[PDB]
């Protein structure tokens, strides 16, 4: 059924699975028209499809031309997401196809289920976890490739950099979700933390800085303090 805190370790077992997050597929800026009405202008988006065990990210860039002349775009965006996820699955060798696909938003269940009718043995699951994958566009290299795209495109990343050489998937996922939650709750402070020391760089082939084990403990602590602080700055505690 649904994925929650009770069945959390299932993410890191040896059954291939993918998270799908559609929160950055349809993106707009709202602005005033010359006549004083309101209008939207779409910007490029992306599907965030992630294997939590391996870190493999399948970043499908959604170019604004896919909305041209379409109506009910927020509805269409869910079906476009499911069409692209289904196309991705079909493009993978059988032994690489997922056994489960977990959507971060329940409105993706029916569109994905319908697009995956041909795959009756792939389970489509929701989750009770509040995952912070909307903040994917706060990662500079992901934001950059999305905003520069001039046509539909798929780009492949490892969102864990080389962490699995030193830590387990469980710990790597915990680090990723702490970082993203921080970027989501206070992007400015989060990014200040991650870069403050210029001697630590981001490798050309990485997304995050090259911290040592000890420096990641410091960073992780600073992200917790940030999240707790905002929680207080918000509710006043």
């Amino acid at each position: 059924g649904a994925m929650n805190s009770s069945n959390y370790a299932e993410l890191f077992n040896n059954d291939i699975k993918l998270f799908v997050d559609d929160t950055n597929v349809y993106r707009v800026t709202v602005h005033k028209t010359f006549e004083g009405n309101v209008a939207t202008k779409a910007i490029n988006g992306c599907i965030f499809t992630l294997n939590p065990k391996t870190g493999h990210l399948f970043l499908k860039i959604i170019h604004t031309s896919v909305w041209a002349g379409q109506k009910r775009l927020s509805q269409l965006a869910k079906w476009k997401t499911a069409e692209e996820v289904s196309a991705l699955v079909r493009s993978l060798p059988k032994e690489e196809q997922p056994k489960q696909i977990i959507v971060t938003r329940k409105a993706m269940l029916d569109p994905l289920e319908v697009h995956m009718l041909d795959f009756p043995n792939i389970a489509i699951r929701p989750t009770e976890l509040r995952l912070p994958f909307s903040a994917a566009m706060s990662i500079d290299k992901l934001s950059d490739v999305v905003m520069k795209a001039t046509e539909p495109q798929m780009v492949l990343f490892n969102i864990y950099d080389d962490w699995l050489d030193r830590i387990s998937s469980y710990t790597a996922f915990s680090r990723l979700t702490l970082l993203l939650r921080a970027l989501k709750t206070n992007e400015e402070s989060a990014k200040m933390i991650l870069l403050s020391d210029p001697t630590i760089t981001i490798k050309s082939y990485h997304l995050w800085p090259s911290f040592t084990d000890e420096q990641w403990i410091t960073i992780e602590s600073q992200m917790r303090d940030l999240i707790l602080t905002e929680y207080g700055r918000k509710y006043n505690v």
């Binding site: 269409l76 079906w79 499911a82 069409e83 029916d110 569109p111 289920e113 319908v114 697009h115 009718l117 041909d118």
Partner: protein, 300 residues
């Protein structure tokens, strides 16, 4: 005017005939039902006084043969049987008519209710949903499951309604996933009407039969089927005008006949609210929406 004679009534039972019902006491001199209107299917149904579990009954058409009911004390139920000796049947019924041992089908002359509930129901279609080819009449009860229920377990005892599943390859053309899910017109008009049912009259007959089994036997899978057949039409943007107008009439009389007290278990809130207030056809069911709002405003 035809007759369903009874051998006797050895156990106390509530007997239904179509939308009417009457109580018979244990060993009461009851010998059947006369004056049954020719030209419609009918249903004769039973609820034992000592065990309200298992409503059951028989769908029949008197044009197809001479049928009588005899209690079987081994299997413990009133059974329909066909009499092949037409002289015996005439003599038996006449004997009983002269002794005034039969109740009269109590139809009010102005009252078109049964016609309106069975307008498109034919015995030949009933006997393909209820498979027992050695009999001209069809047994149904509270507990029989549908072919679709059994897929999600005795096949010989199933209700073979047409399977409708909105998230199935039958319902969804490859490459038209969003279009076909959000507008079921393809599935209604091409797959079901042209493909399976051949015409809207057979579709409506099955819909009406499913409603009657839901109402008279509390058969849960029949209620599922009735609601699925309504929802498939309401969720289609392109439906022939004559079908929409007929559906409104069909549903109006189903809602009108439903016991006011069974609406909590026989009506599906989501289906009805979707059909009357959100679907493509929200503005096409004027009579049904008016009776529903005045009779069952709580559901909505």
């Amino acid at each position: 005017m035809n007759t369903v004679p009874f051998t006797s009534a050895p156990i106390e039972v509530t007997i239904g005939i179509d939308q009417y019902s009457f109580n018979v006491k244990e060993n009461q001199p009851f010998h059947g039902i006369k004056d049954i209107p020719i030209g419609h299917v009918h249903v004769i149904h039973f609820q034992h006084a000592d065990n309200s579990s298992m409503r059951y009954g028989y769908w029949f058409d008197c044009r197809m043969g001479n049928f009588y009911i005899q209690y079987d004390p081994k299997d413990g139920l009133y059974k329909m049987m066909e009499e092949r000796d037409g002289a015996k049947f005439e003599n038996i019924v006449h004997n009983f008519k002269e002794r005034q041992m039969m109740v009269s089908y109590p139809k009010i002359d102005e009252d078109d209710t049964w016609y309106n509930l069975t307008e498109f129901v034919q015995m030949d279609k009933i006997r393909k949903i209820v498979r027992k080819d050695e009999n001209q009449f069809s047994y149904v009860d509270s507990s029989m499951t549908t072919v679709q229920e059994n897929e999600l377990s005795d096949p010989a005892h199933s209700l073979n309604y047409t399977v409708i599943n909105f998230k199935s390859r039958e319902a969804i053309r490859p490459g038209h996933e969003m279009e076909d899910f959000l507008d079921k017109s393809y599935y209604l008009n091409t797959v079901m009407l042209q493909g399976i049912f051949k015409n809207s009259s057979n579709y409506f007959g099955e819909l009406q039969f499913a409603f009657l089994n839901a109402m008279f036997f509390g058969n849960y899978g029949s209620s599922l089927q009735w609601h699925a057949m309504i929802e498939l039409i309401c969720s289609s943007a392109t439906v022939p005008k004559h079908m929409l107008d007929k559906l409104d009439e069909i549903l109006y009389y189903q809602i009108k006949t439903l016991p006011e007290q069974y609406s909590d278990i026989l009506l599906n809130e989501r289906v009805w609210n979707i059909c009357l207030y959100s679907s493509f056809q929200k503005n096409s069911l004027h009579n049904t929406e008016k009776i529903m709002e005045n009779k069952y405003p709580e559901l909505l």
